[PDB]
Amino acid sequence: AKTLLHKYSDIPEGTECHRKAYASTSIGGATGLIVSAYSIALKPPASFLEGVARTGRYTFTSAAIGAIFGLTSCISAQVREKPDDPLNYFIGGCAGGLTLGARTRSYGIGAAACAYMGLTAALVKMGQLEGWQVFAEPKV
Amino acid sequence: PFFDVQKRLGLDLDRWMTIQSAEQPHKIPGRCHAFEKEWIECAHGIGGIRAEK
Amino acid sequence: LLDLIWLETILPKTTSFIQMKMSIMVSNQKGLIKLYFLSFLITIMISMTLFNYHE
Amino acid sequence: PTIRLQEDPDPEDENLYEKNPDSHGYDKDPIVDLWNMRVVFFFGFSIVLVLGSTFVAYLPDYRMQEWARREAERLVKYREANGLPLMESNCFDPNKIQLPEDED
Amino acid sequence: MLKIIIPTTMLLPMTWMSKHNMIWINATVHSLLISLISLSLLNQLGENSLNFSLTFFSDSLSAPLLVLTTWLLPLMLMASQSHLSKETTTRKKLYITMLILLQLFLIMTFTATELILFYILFEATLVPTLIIITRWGNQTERLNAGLYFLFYTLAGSLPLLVALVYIQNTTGSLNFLIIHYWSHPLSNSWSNIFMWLACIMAFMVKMPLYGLHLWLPKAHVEAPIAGSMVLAAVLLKLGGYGMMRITTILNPLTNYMAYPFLMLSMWGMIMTSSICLRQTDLKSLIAYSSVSHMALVIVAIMIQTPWSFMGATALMIAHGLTSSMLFCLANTNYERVHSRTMILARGLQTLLPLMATWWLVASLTNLALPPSINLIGELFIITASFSWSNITIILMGMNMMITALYSLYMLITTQRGKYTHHINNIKPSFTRENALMALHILPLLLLTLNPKMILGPLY
Amino acid sequence: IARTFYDGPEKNYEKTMAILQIEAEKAELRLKELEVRRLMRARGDGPWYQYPTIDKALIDHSPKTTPDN
Amino acid sequence: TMMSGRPGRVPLQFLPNEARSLPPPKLTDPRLVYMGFLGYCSGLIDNAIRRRPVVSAGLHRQLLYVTSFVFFGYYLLKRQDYMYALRDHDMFAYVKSHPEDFPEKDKKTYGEILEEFHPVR
Amino acid sequence: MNPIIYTTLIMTVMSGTMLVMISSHWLLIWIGFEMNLLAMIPVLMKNFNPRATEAATKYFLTQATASMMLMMAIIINLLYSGQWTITKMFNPVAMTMMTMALAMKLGLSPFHFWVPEVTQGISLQAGLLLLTWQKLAPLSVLCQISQSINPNLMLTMAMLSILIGGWGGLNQTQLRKIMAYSSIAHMGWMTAVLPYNTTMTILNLLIYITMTLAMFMLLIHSSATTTLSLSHTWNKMPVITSLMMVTLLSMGGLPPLSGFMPKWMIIQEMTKNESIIMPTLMAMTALLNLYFYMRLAYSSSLTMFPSTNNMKMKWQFEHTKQMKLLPTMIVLSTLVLPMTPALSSLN
Amino acid sequence: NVLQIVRDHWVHILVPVGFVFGCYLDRRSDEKLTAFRNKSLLFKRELRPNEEVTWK
Ligand SMILES: CCCCCCCCCCCCCCCCCC(=O)OC[C@H](COP(=O)([O-])OCC(O)COP(=O)([O-])OC[C@@H](COC(=O)CCCCCCCCCCCCCCCCC)OC(=O)CCCCCCCCCCCCCCCCC)OC(=O)CCCCCCCCCCCCCCCCC
Ligand SMILES: CCCCCCCCCCCCCCCCCC(=O)OC[C@H](COP(=O)([O-])OCC(O)COP(=O)([O-])OC[C@@H](COC(=O)CCCCCCCCCCCCCCCCC)OC(=O)CCCCCCCCCCCCCCCCC)OC(=O)CCCCCCCCCCCCCCCCC
Ligand SMILES: CCCCCCCCCCCCCCCCCC(=O)OC[C@H](COP(=O)([O-])OCC(O)COP(=O)([O-])OC[C@@H](COC(=O)CCCCCCCCCCCCCCCCC)OC(=O)CCCCCCCCCCCCCCCCC)OC(=O)CCCCCCCCCCCCCCCCC
Numbered sequence A: 001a002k003t004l005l006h007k008y009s010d011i012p013e014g015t016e017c018h019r020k021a022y023a024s025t026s027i028g029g030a031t032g033l034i035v036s037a038y039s040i041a042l043k044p045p046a047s048f049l050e051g052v053a054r055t056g057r058y059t060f061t062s063a064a065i066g067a068i069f070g071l072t073s074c075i076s077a078q079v080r081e082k083p084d085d086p087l088n089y090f091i092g093g094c095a096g097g098l099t100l101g102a103r104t105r106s107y108g109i110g111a112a113a114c115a116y117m118g119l120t121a122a123l124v125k126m127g128q129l130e131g132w133q134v135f136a137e138p139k140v
Numbered sequence B: 001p002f003f004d005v006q007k008r009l010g011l012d013l014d015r016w017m018t019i020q021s022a023e024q025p026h027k028i029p030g031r032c033h034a035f036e037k038e039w040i041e042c043a044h045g046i047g048g049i050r051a052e053k
Numbered sequence C: 001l002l003d004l005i006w007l008e009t010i011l012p013k014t015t016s017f018i019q020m021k022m023s024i025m026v027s028n029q030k031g032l033i034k035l036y037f038l039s040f041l042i043t044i045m046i047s048m049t050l051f052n053y054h055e
Numbered sequence D: 001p002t003i004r005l006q007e008d009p010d011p012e013d014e015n016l017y018e019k020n021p022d023s024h025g026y027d028k029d030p031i032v033d034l035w036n037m038r039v040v041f042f043f044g045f046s047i048v049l050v051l052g053s054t055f056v057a058y059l060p061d062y063r064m065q066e067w068a069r070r071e072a073e074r075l076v077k078y079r080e081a082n083g084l085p086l087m088e089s090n091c092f093d094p095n096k097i098q099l100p101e102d103e104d
Numbered sequence E: 001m002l003k004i005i006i007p008t009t010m011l012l013p014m015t016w017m018s019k020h021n022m023i024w025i026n027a028t029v030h031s032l033l034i035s036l037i038s039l040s041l042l043n044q045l046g047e048n049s050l051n052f053s054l055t056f057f058s059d060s061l062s063a064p065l066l067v068l069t070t071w072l073l074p075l076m077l078m079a080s081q082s083h084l085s086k087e088t089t090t091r092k093k094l095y096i097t098m099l100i101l102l103q104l105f106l107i108m109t110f111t112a113t114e115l116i117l118f119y120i121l122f123e124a125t126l127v128p129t130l131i132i133i134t135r136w137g138n139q140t141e142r143l144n145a146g147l148y149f150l151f152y153t154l155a156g157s158l159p160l161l162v163a164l165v166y167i168q169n170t171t172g173s174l175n176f177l178i179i180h181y182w183s184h185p186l187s188n189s190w191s192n193i194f195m196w197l198a199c200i201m202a203f204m205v206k207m208p209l210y211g212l213h214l215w216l217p218k219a220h221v222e223a224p225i226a227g228s229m230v231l232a233a234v235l236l237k238l239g240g241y242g243m244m245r246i247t248t249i250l251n252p253l254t255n256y257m258a259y260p261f262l263m264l265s266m267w268g269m270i271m272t273s274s275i276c277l278r279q280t281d282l283k284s285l286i287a288y289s290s291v292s293h294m295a296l297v298i299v300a301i302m303i304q305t306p307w308s309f310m311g312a313t314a315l316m317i318a319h320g321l322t323s324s325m326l327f328c329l330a331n332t333n334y335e336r337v338h339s340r341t342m343i344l345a346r347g348l349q350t351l352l353p354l355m356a357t358w359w360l361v362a363s364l365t366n367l368a369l370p371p372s373i374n375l376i377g378e379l380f381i382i383t384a385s386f387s388w389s390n391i392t393i394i395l396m397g398m399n400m401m402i403t404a405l406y407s408l409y410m411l412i413t414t415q416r417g418k419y420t421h422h423i424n425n426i427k428p429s430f431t432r433e434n435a436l437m438a439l440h441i442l443p444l445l446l447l448t449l450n451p452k453m454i455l456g457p458l459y
Numbered sequence F: 001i002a003r004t005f006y007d008g009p010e011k012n013y014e015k016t017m018a019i020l021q022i023e024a025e026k027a028e029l030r031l032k033e034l035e036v037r038r039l040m041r042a043r044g045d046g047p048w049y050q051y052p053t054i055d056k057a058l059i060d061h062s063p064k065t066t067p068d069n
Numbered sequence G: 001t002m003m004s005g006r007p008g009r010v011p012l013q014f015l016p017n018e019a020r021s022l023p024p025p026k027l028t029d030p031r032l033v034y035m036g037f038l039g040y041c042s043g044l045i046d047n048a049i050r051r052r053p054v055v056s057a058g059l060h061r062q063l064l065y066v067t068s069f070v071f072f073g074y075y076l077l078k079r080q081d082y083m084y085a086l087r088d089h090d091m092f093a094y095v096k097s098h099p100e101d102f103p104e105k106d107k108k109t110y111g112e113i114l115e116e117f118h119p120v121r
Numbered sequence H: 001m002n003p004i005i006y007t008t009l010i011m012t013v014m015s016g017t018m019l020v021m022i023s024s025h026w027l028l029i030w031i032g033f034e035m036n037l038l039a040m041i042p043v044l045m046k047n048f049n050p051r052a053t054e055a056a057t058k059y060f061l062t063q064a065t066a067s068m069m070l071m072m073a074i075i076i077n078l079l080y081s082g083q084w085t086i087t088k089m090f091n092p093v094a095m096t097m098m099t100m101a102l103a104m105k106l107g108l109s110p111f112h113f114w115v116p117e118v119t120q121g122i123s124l125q126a127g128l129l130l131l132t133w134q135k136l137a138p139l140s141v142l143c144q145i146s147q148s149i150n151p152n153l154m155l156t157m158a159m160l161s162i163l164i165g166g167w168g169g170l171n172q173t174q175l176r177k178i179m180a181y182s183s184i185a186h187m188g189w190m191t192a193v194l195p196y197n198t199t200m201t202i203l204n205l206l207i208y209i210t211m212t213l214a215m216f217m218l219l220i221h222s223s224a225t226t227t228l229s230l231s232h233t234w235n236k237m238p239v240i241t242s243l244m245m246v247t248l249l250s251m252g253g254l255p256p257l258s259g260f261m262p263k264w265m266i267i268q269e270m271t272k273n274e275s276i277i278m279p280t281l282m283a284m285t286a287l288l289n290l291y292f293y294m295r296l297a298y299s300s301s302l303t304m305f306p307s308t309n310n311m312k313m314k315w316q317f318e319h320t321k322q323m324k325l326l327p328t329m330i331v332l333s334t335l336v337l338p339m340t341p342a343l344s345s346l347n
Numbered sequence I: 001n002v003l004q005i006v007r008d009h010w011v012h013i014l015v016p017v018g019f020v021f022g023c024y025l026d027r028r029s030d031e032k033l034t035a036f037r038n039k040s041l042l043f044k045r046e047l048r049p050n051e052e053v054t055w056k
């Protein structure tokens, strides 16, 4: 659960690239498993083997996205010696988008995923820096 | 939401069964009558926010 | 190249295409109660082991 | 029917000059058309335009610019005669400003 | 200032209570009277604005825009009573109701002292324009034009509401006087950067900016004549007025944050001026000319110097008048020929001499001929930009050259040459069209006589 | 024109003074209200944000057929 | 919901006796005029839907519409004013009761407050 | 169905929801829910056909499952504190059960699947009842236990509801499914502000009920259940089309129309306590609802679709049974924005 | 012949009476902002022997 996000976050950003990549790929694998479960429940695969194939496809794609994102972000933050910079997360997000485009074999999907995933990862980094809240606790 | 008509009219439609220390038949007490009574007395006055601290 | 093609492609046409795809994906259910009741079960398991586990 | 609709034929343009050689291009009925022209001309060119322009041209000097010129004349006269600088660099009195005590 | 608002809300039932053949006369007469009354706000104190009440105030920037709107309504009524002759009485009254409601919302927009009220009216101006465009258009593309016009505005202006409510939660007020007196600098943080973006992008897409201008050609071509007039004359100036009002809170972030918008504005001004040359349509050329002029206004507002502000105000007023006149001139030819192609009807000077003169005057005022207020605004903006950076003069001069080129190109193609030999239904010009042209053009010259009325509050 | 249509500058001056006072008071009151709401929801001791508890009048203080309770 | 539970609050009163110490809204109140205008609009829409002469079909019906809207609006405005007065009263009582959380800070003049200057160039 | 039986079933439905809204005991609330469902099932099947039968079956199955989860939540909360009063509900697992059960009863996503189908399978009167009246009791229970409820769970379902409502409404041509998806999207907005301020929830509920009532009553007036069937009423009752277009604009969230007031107030309330991202997402998503409302308006009044020859015979007849409250609902659905400060009379 | 002309041109007074009503409402709005009349530090001035208000 949220313990996986603790695993990803408790690691200092520009250190231990292998562990951070492992945490990111675990998060991606969990997300892919959830997506595949919903897809099977709502769109039956007509056979057990095809359902397993679809589950494996979704899980592997999501795990690849997570691994590439984490690895690229950590490496870019380490070589530039400048942590706390949204550019690193943007590069990681575009790397994940290129991975998605390669997995689905679509150049346009790849470019769009680069752009949008890089943007959203950059905003996630800025929210981490400035302390933005998605589900803010009631304060008034 | 909660249109409190029992409090307005003084009817007691379903308040007799809410708690454990409220007028059981033949005066049979609940297993935790004293604890619930103590909690209710301390609890009733301050409000919900202070009642948890 | 700029107005009639690319400035149309980036902001409005991309938005229309994405919303079309998502509307199609959401709004194709065969109506069988079995499938989305299974989805309800998946939602129940998720919620109980992703939200209230940490308090 | 080798067609798709029970559709009216597309009407051809109606010329205002055919039934009215002096039309003014406002309406079909000549009297209301002439009066529409008359009111448009009287309230656009006669009332709003000329009277409005002569009203705007004679607005009182609420912008305080002749007043500003007179103020400048008197201040220049007084300052130059006394030997004082024509204009002073500090807009406010330095005595009423409390700068930070030190910068170390 | 209810002495202007209430007469419009009385224009409504008076229009609805008129005889079947007296609606145009009454509407025109009383709208002209209301514009004459609104001409009384030009008396502005040099010190501060006129604060009539807690809700409404008038500034030196608001008064020319108010006068322009009140003067615009009668011209729109005059231009609309040609293609609506076959309409029923109820639909004519509904059209006039839309025009009157648009004027009322515009009047209440330029004088609202509170930013949320300004936003509410600024967005209330969307419903009547949309109804007009999508109900009284002519081609099948009016539906897409209306959808683009609505969604480009809304997708950029919804974040503005969040920004404004957050501002009121933080500072404690949204009244413009309190905002201006209690203004404080904005630090360099991502939160403040997105605050800048939220406050700016709504007015940017209302200008429009070069990258967000795709809705303007569709809306201005597919709308009826009154819709095009009101879009190109006043509805575009809402964004400029909004930035000139909202920029006070933004500094010092704006100096750092204006580089992409300035670059887009300058280069897109060049690009749209070049696009005007290779245009096969007549209304699209005027739409792109509007885009170029409004990009110049964007540059003026963004560099944020007093000379730039005065130039922006003058250019806004001058462009409103000129673009309205050009749209009416194109509409007359469209009514004659029933097509929008430029090269269809040629050599109209030999058939319509007075319209040839009106075309010449409109084109001359479009390319900033001295000493018209168009040139005053353009020159003030150019001088302010030159002070900002000496290299901008290259882009400004190139824009001036291309503007002259496409203006004279349109004038020569539509008016000079030989006639088309097969259009024999070009009737002589009516009195209504000539009167509309004169009422468009005379105020421009009367204003260049006394240019201090339209130079804004920085004068 | 100035005698017939307009007034003196002092009227506008004092009107905008009063308007500024009103708006400043409203701004201060809004900020104070936000702070008061935050404190009263955090603490819970204020009149606002009171959540209902169990009335003590429902308890029965009578012998309970067993000595202890 | 901050004010749903409050001390000494009769459940379904809609107008406590404590609200009679506030000045009632004037009968020429602009909000009441807007309520009457809403009633008139509803009457006109009623006439239009039933395919009747919109302006002058039923005068008694339009009068009833207007008077019903005004009658409800009077009490709605009374309750709204009572609730806002109650909010302000509670706010002032709380700020007085807890002086340490709302201290009176110093009053510096601009002659000694140092604000950084940002040139425009 | 006999009129006495119909009116007593309607009164039993209202009695069940009132029993929910006026009870302090959890058991009485559950009894009110059971009574509401029991008397609500036949109302859907007033006009018998296979579609109505299967709509009633799906509705019954969903509501029975929700009631089972709700009673399990009540029993667990009793287990960890011998209390029956509807209060904080401290226990996290029991609170999760109650929140999910009430979401399933309301139609919030991901439990939103049943609403479009049941709405399409029943008549316009039953659809009106289902979409307006059947939201009061779960919302009342949610408002009572709002402080106890977890923000993350509540927020996630509200955002999902808004997104899925918009995307589903983008596709449908049938009017009843459009109304159902719009109802889901509005439920998202109302449950979004629930943890922060229940007064905004009540205000949004009131305005949504008014708008939905006006829209359904106009749809009943011009007896059309599809887009093309609604495209004919311009040739019979143009005033109805104009009023419907104005109401559809109001539903979209445009200002100066009233519909905007709940959206504006919810954004303002969520901003008071440092929730900036969520209101922005909800507004940009409600743009989709506006889009498909606008498509319906284009089809309905702003254009003129081809008509049929038999409409000439309808031209000669008047609508016999007239809805008395339609004009008031239209006026309250459109022109009530200037009276925003009167929302203080709700707390 | 006052009958027909009045019953056909009674609408030509709505705008003028609206203007008069607007002026009257503006005057009333001015009447509620007299909190600093003859109290501003710039225009503070002793009254004339007969007048009672600096402005209305
Ligand atoms: C308090 C609240 C909590 C409540 C919950 C409490 C639950 C706990 C107690 C439950 C005890 C069970 C008692 C009775 C249950 C009733 C069962 C029933 O009635 O069956 C009807 C139902 C309908 O029967 P039918 O339609 O008449 O006959 C259809 C034909 O048989 C064949 O049909 P077909 O061949 O024509 O169609 C193809 C095939 C399709 O089948 C498939 O394609 C299977 C695909 C699954 C993927 C395989 C995994 C591969 C990767 C795994 C990775 C693991 C992590 C490692 C890291 C990454 C490495 C990759 O069938 C389907 O289309 C249906 C799909 C259903 C599959 C199983 C459903 C489980 C939940 C839904 C999620 C699906 C899993 C996705 C992946 C999730 C992660 C693993 O039967 C079935 O759906 C299949 C048989 C089910 C038997 C097992 C049921 C027990 C499990 C229940 C779920 C609860 C979780 C269990 C414990 C969890 C820990 C807490
Ligand atoms: C706001 C004002 C106005 C703005 C509006 C206007 C501007 C915006 C709109 C225009 C830009 C949008 C283009 C982006 C991608 C769209 C392509 C597309 O639709 O995909 C589906 C489309 C068709 O979909 P499909 O059905 O799956 O494929 C069927 C194909 O027919 C089958 O094709 P094929 O298999 O026969 O052959 C294709 C294949 C074989 O390749 C070729 O055939 C020809 C080679 C083309 C790409 C190879 C790269 C070498 C050329 C790049 C040279 C430098 C670029 C300029 C920098 C100058 C430096 C001073 O291509 C590749 O394999 C290349 C893979 C990846 C290479 C791309 C990396 C280069 C990016 C440039 C970096 C610049 C950094 C910043 C520097 C500037 C600042 C100082 O795919 C393509 O065919 C084209 C893909 C390759 C085009 C790359 C062009 C990118 C230009 C720079 C992008 C940066 C701007 C965006 C920022 C965020 C992105 C990170
Ligand atoms: C902010 C300031 C105030 C502004 C507030 C907003 C405006 C006012 C409030 C609105 C509600 C009031 C009226 C609405 C219901 C009226 C129903 C209607 O259809 O009217 C037709 C009716 C004409 O029918 P008729 O005379 O029986 O015979 C012809 C047949 O009806 C033949 O009829 P037909 O059915 O055969 O005609 C077909 C037509 C029939 O369809 C229609 O006529 C459309 C009906 C309007 C929609 C109602 C919307 C509900 C209210 C929401 C307003 C939204 C405001 C926000 C801004 C956005 C605008 C959308 O359908 C079409 O043509 C389809 C074209 C599609 C166009 C799409 C536009 C539709 C929406 C436009 C709404 C504009 C706002 C309302 C303005 C007034 C319009 C009457 O008009 C009237 O005669 C009454 C109008 C009001 C009279 C005011 C008089 C006041 C008292 C007189 C003296 C004044 C003071 C004296 C004292 C002086 C001191 C001494």
Ligand SMILES: CCCCCCCCCCCCCCCCC[C@@H](O)O[C@H](CO[C@H](O)CCCCCCCCCCCCCCC)COP(=O)(O)OCC[N+](C)(C)C
Binding pocket: A086, A087, A090, A119, A122, E188, E189, E190, E193, E211, E212, E260
């Ligand atoms: C079609 C036209 C539509 C409108 C276009 C609007 C343009 C909006 C773009 C915003 C301009 C600037 C935004 C942020 C300001 C600085 C950007 C960056 O270049 O500065 C560097 C920042 O380093 C990195 O570049 C950060 C940005 C990297 C991630 C952002 C994504 C940018 C890629 C392009 C995305 C596409 C944008 C348009 C979407 C459609 C300097 O580093 P540093 O001085 O230490 O930090 C500056 C910020 N501080 C001071 C608040 C801390």
Ligand SMILES: CCCCCCCC/C=C\CCCCCCCC(=O)O[C@H](COC(=O)CCCCCCC/C=C/CCCCCCCC)COP(=O)(O)OCCN
Binding pocket: A123, A130, A131, A132, E152, E153, E155, E156, E159, E162, E163, E166, E191, E192, E194, E195, E197, E198, E201, E205, E212, H274, H275, H276, H277, H280
């Ligand atoms: C025609 C289409 C045009 C589309 C334009 C849309 C983009 C508008 C720009 C962003 C709008 C949202 C910004 C939020 C509004 C202001 C809120 C604010 O100022 O608060 C910020 C919050 O800032 C944010 O949350 C921003 C999150 C952004 C999420 C949505 C991003 C939308 C797309 C991003 C890129 C768009 C920008 C450029 C687009 C150019 C046009 C294509 C500070 O948070 P605090 O609670 O005060 O805490 C700080 C102290 N601890």
